[PDB]
């Protein structure tokens, strides 16, 4: 019944003033892309930065199993678009946020499916 909870550990470490994980691999791109959250190639728009996925995954970076029962990683081998204002902590951002399964945008950072 014991499983280490790294997501909660990083969240608390952040709340208590810890330096976010560094050396997330930021890509050069046009910044005229679709803006979607996780893509097979950099897709940052004017308000985002594109990163290599594995370097932004808490589980990859910490050498710990992925919460997926299959161990599969949502980020490895892909590229994650981070809002420029949050690019100081890509790992924290991808951890705390969710991708809209309809439009592929970050919930609350581009997803307008719930607007009327």
């Amino acid at each position: 019944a014991f499983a280490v909870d790294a997501a909660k550990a990083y969240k608390d470490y952040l709340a208590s003033g810890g330096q976010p994980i560094t050396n997330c691999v930021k890509m050069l791109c046009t910044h005229t892309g679709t803006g979607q959250a996780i893509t097979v190639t950099p897709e940052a728009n004017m308000d985002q930065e594109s990163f290599g996925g594995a370097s932004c995954c808490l589980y990859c970076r910490c050498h710990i199993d992925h919460p997926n029962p299959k161990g599969f990683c949502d980020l490895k081998g892909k590229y994650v678009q981070i809002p420029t204002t949050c690019a100081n902590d890509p790992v924290g951002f991808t951890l705390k946020n969710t991708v809209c399964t309809v439009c592929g945008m970050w919930k609350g950072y581009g997803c307008s499916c719930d607007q009327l």
């Binding site: 050396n23 190639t41 594995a54 370097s55 050498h63 081998g77």
Partner: protein, 301 residues
């Protein structure tokens, strides 16, 4: 002049044709650094300009392309170069990378250990190596052709590089190998490319374009490295990050290059001509299987 707006500078042909003696490398702008875009690593910028230059050559780009990347780990535990290669290569390209120490990567498969422990059943369309030991930067000792991972790379090319494939191998003043220069003569074209972001370094990427599996021209590797250092010594390259800001044409073009299985007897001049133009790859198209040799030891008592 306009060199500052290119991704880098390639060794001009006339310098390849000289018979220089090896001298110490003395770069005018040693120690200077280019101004990278905000928050961009040197290695992202370096690999980006490498790929931008590779876009100007006649690379074979088949469906289900196979690329292997040696020396892919940084001291930061991540793989910046691999991330650029995967961005550059067409989506779906099989990308394997390797390094001595553990690192997290976006490659489809990653092998940890000395490159001599890496084995693959299949052949490859593109080999990238950034392998380097900084303890070769000893100026107080003579600068001879190095072996180590260069011996592996030379054999890996001759054994596991598909005809028509290409390579880009990192060298420096002291990190070089004569047989690798000689192997450049087994491609339809070759050069030593210096990225504009790292122009203050004796680093270059030895690029072999379209592998032919036989000597097209005879190259003395000791002379050619001396030729390279002479070029570097007499041609200051202006550090520049200009090309990093235009990525609109960055993706490698999926040329759909044809892949055939052929036998040494069937390689005629029509074939060799197609290979030389980046229009043909020769290898089997089976599944890609790799492995890392593991030494077993019991240290108890």
């Amino acid at each position: 002049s306009s060199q500052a707006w290119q991704p880098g500078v390639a060794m001009p042909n006339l310098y390849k044709m000289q018979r220089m003696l090896l001298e110490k490398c003395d770069l005018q702008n040693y120690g200077d650094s280019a101004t990278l875009p905000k928050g961009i690593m040197m290695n992202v910028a370096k690999y980006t300009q490498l790929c931008q230059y590779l876009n100007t050559l006649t690379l074979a780009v088949p469906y289900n392309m196979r690329v292997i990347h040696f020396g892919a780990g940084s001291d930061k535990g991540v793989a910046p170069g691999t991330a650029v290669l995967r961005q550059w290569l067409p989506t779906g390209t099989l990308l394997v990378d390797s390094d001595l120490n553990d690192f997290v990567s976006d490659a489809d498969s990653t092998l940890i250990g000395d490159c001599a422990t890496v084995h693959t059943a299949n052949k490859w369309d593109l080999i990238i190596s950034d392998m380097y030991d900084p303890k070769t930067k000893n100026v107080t000792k003579e600068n001879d052709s190095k072996e180590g991972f260069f011996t592996y790379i030379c054999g890996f090319i001759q054994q596991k590089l598909a005809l028509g494939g290409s390579v880009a191998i990192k060298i420096t003043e002291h990190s070089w190998n004569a047989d690798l220069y000689k192997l450049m003569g087994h491609f339809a074209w070759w050069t030593a490319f210096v990225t504009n972001v790292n122009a203050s370094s004796s680093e270059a990427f030895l690029i072999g374009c379209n592998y032919l599996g036989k000597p097209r021209e005879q190259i003395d590797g000791y002379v050619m490295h001396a030729n390279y250092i002479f070029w570097r010594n007499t041609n200051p390259i202006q550090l520049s990050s200009y090309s990093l800001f235009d990525m609109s044409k960055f993706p490698l073009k999926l040329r759909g290059t044809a892949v055939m299985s052929l036998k040494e007897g069937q390689i005629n001049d029509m074939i060799l001509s197609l290979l030389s133009k980046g229009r043909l790859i020769i290898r089997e198209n089976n599944r890609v299987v790799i492995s890392s040799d593991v030494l077993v030891n019991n240290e108890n008592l």
